[PDB]
């Protein structure tokens, strides 16, 4: 989907940042082999499965540089540390093993081709565009209905990095859904953006992430090129 669908909320003053939900990702019993839970690889773990784990927090206004690398002191051990400031979540959590979901809308600054590059330990699955992530101003009623991943990265597999090159209009807000998991040990998340004119990758998404309330009618995009 080189031409993803965007949305036109036409809201007075849009809310900055994405929404985030954190969930437990416990280790297997302390004599299991391997030590980590393999659920994160089940096809429905990112859709239904994470809901069977403990909710840690629902957070709003996630904006900034969301990238991090966490070096675990040791493996097969649940250890506590903190996320970067952009996450709006200040208390220590199990950085060695956890599940994290982000959702909202991406707003381009400049119309044209955008390349989002991702890499992750252990997993990062990205949906992008109306329908694919969720429907315009109808997130709640389409929350679990996301399509094929527009990018996906799994540590240790023959696709440990991925990118997505899409033509975007600055006039639209694009549904986005980012699902992360760390199963054990080190954790890492990299999202960068490359546009055709700007020389270097963008890593600070402060001005690009937004949240909008759902509306009865929805808010389909009012820019189209057919
Ligand atoms: C493959 C494997 O299990 N490696 C062990 C380490 O755990 C993995 O580490 C990688 C990072 O290199 C990654 O984060 C993955 O999610 C982890 O499961 C770790 O357990 C280490 C113990 O000191 O030993 C490796 O065998
Ligand atoms: Ca890991």
Automatic annotation (TrEMBL):
Ca(2+) binds at residues 121-122, 182, 184, 186. Disulfide bonds join 7-136, 35-76, 137-219. Residues 49-207 form the PA14 domain. It comes from the Eukaryota. This is PA14 domain-containing protein. It comes from Candida glabrata (strain ATCC 2001 / BCRC 20586 / JCM 3761 / NBRC 0622 / NRRL Y-65 / CBS 138). The chain holds residues 44 to 269 of 715 of the full protein.
